[PDB]
């Protein structure tokens, strides 16, 4: 098989600036007919890949003009002349010379936007859940940038560990932010033995840690 290798695999770019993605092939994609057999796709989260460039430098009809492909032989580049916030996703190159068609590892384009601190919300367990024995306490961190963030759970001022799980969204295609949920899981019996439930958030955008809490 032909091995395709892309770089960088993570590409942070300020909107309005250019972005370049490199793709290298383990053997030449230049054909005696003069064409180079290399294609580029963009895969947006939860979608199938979408064809951008074929034959090395042909823009697929309907693809915005800011996308262009160049290169020859074993060395190829996808260039976005001026990146738009909707350009977030994973970019793949693929050789179109032989079967099996083989793909690069994928380059995730990330939009470098201004820092935004999370807005924090906390949700107590509902009676509809508690009647079957489990208590989920949910802490929401909404619309922040830097994706890096830390959530610590306190129960009657006692720091928790081992009983929470986080999930983070993909970067928003309009405002370039992330959101995060942290879910604390207790038995109903343990839940009703304590009063203060607090989610404590640290993030680059917060001059001090922010805490949201409730009493049962």
């Amino acid at each position: 098989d032909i091995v395709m290798t892309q770089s960088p695999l993570s590409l942070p770019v300020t909107p309005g600036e250019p972005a370049s993605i490199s793709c290298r092939s383990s053997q030449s994609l230049l054909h005696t007919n003069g064409n180079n057999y290399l294609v580029w796709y963009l895969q947006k989260p939860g979608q199938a890949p979408h064809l951008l460039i074929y034959l090395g430098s042909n823009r697929a009809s309907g693809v915005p003009g800011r996308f262009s492909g160049s290169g020859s032989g074993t060395d190829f580049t996808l260039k976005i002349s001026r990146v738009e916030v909707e350009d977030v996703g994973v970019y793949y190159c693929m050789q179109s010379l032989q079967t099996p068609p083989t793909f690069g590892q994928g380059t995730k384009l990330e939009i470098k936007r201004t820092v935004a601190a999370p807005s924090v919300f906390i949700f107590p367990p509902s009676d509809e859940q508690l009647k079957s024995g489990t208590a989920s306490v949910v802490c929401l961190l909404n619309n922040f940038y830097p994706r890096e963030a830390k959530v610590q759970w306190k129960v009657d001022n006692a720091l928790q560990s081992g009983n929470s799980q986080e999930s983070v969204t993909e970067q928003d295609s309009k405002d370039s932010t992330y959101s995060l949920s942290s879910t604390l899981t207790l038995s109903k019996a343990d839940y009703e033995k304590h009063k203060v439930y607090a989610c404590e958030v640290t993030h680059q955008g917060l001059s001090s840690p922010v805490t949201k809490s409730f009493n049962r």
Partner: protein, 539 residues
Amino acid sequence: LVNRKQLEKMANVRFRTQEDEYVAILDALEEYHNMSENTVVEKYLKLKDINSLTDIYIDTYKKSGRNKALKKFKEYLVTEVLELKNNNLTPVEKNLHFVWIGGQINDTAINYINQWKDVNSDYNVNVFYDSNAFLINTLKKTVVESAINDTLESFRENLNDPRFDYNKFFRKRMEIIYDKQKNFINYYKAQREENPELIIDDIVKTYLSNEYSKEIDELNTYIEESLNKITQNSGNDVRNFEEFKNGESFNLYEQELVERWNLAAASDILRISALKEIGGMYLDVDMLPGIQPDLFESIEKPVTVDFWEMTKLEAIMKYKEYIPEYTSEHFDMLDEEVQSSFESVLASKSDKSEIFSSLGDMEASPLEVKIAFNSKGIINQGLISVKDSYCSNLIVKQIENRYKILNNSLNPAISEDNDFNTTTNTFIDSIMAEANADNGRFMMELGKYLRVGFFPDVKTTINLSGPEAYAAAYQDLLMFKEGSMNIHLIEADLRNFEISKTNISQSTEQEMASLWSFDDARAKAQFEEYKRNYFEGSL
């Protein structure tokens, strides 16, 4: 030209999978139809890319069911080029370009040029000359004269035997001319190196004085009279033509001028560069203005189309006398009722502008160069082009490529410093090893290069710098390529580029004297002349 949807239907093949190389054609064709606001040359270049993409497909999928329809699409691309050519015209710059290099211009050329001046007062006129090289004709004439006498003296058999094979004379003389020319070339190359301030006429003057005992005084007078005569007749110096001097054709120009003494080939090279850089109309000095169309339209024509045209000029010149010493031969042998009918029509006119037409405001495609035709096909004695036209570039490149092929085999053969026969065999053998079906006829004519102008029945110049280079450039245009060798275009294709006969009188007395080429009858008549001088001890 078909749009994308129409090509999709035309090239639809049952059960054919779509190919990237096919979609590339479709995308490019759609881009073409969105180019309404681009220049004609940009549109041609897009058609060229569409043709190249179609060829890539056909070469990649040799057994594709699409290929029949795609070859028809390629025909449609050619038709669109002609549509572009015919529907987008721009003004032709009002310049008339003549060329007189390598010696003094003679009065008959001036008198012809003056006819164009007199009926085109809105046109600028250039007569390009080379201020460094007035002595080339003298050098060639002197060397050839001496080679003739050397050849006759060399014979160890009886010269005036009436059955003498005079081709023995031309073969031997060629061996001697080649040696003399080689000697001068080596002297010139050495002198140029040793003193880069010397111009050609400096080196020729010294060479002629030392080698042929010519008087430097008479050569200086000749140069001064030549310069004074040309600069009183719209002369413009090649040596100030910076675009020409700095391009890849200047060394080919000087190869012909200085090494081969072929002023016709040098003028071939210069004329199309002049046209490309300035625009206008190039004319050989034996061409005359078009005759006013309605002038002799009441006189019915009795011989041929060319003969009727020739006697039109002879009539004009007998009864108006614009050019003295113009012939009446083909006129002086007509019936009186029509001969005097010519005198009668001309008596009704008093101004030259009722005899000769004017060029006026002309326009042409930025793609094209228009060329004169005669009974034998295209001929570069007249050319029309807007400045920097696409074809003028294709023609310049055709000449440069043909010289590259020539010189790649010629220069190594000459470098061995062998005699003429040995050099020729090495050169021909090198040429033949690069011959194929596409270029064979051209390569065959290239093999005679060293004989040009010293030997009968040699057609090399026409294939190198002359009309074949134009036909090949037109083929380059219509077939979206460069480097055409063998010509597939038929006369109908080439006639897309004709200059209208209304704009030039080609059947002139001087033109006829210029197409009596180096025949076999000419070679025999020349030998008779040389023998006569030889048996009186003159040159």
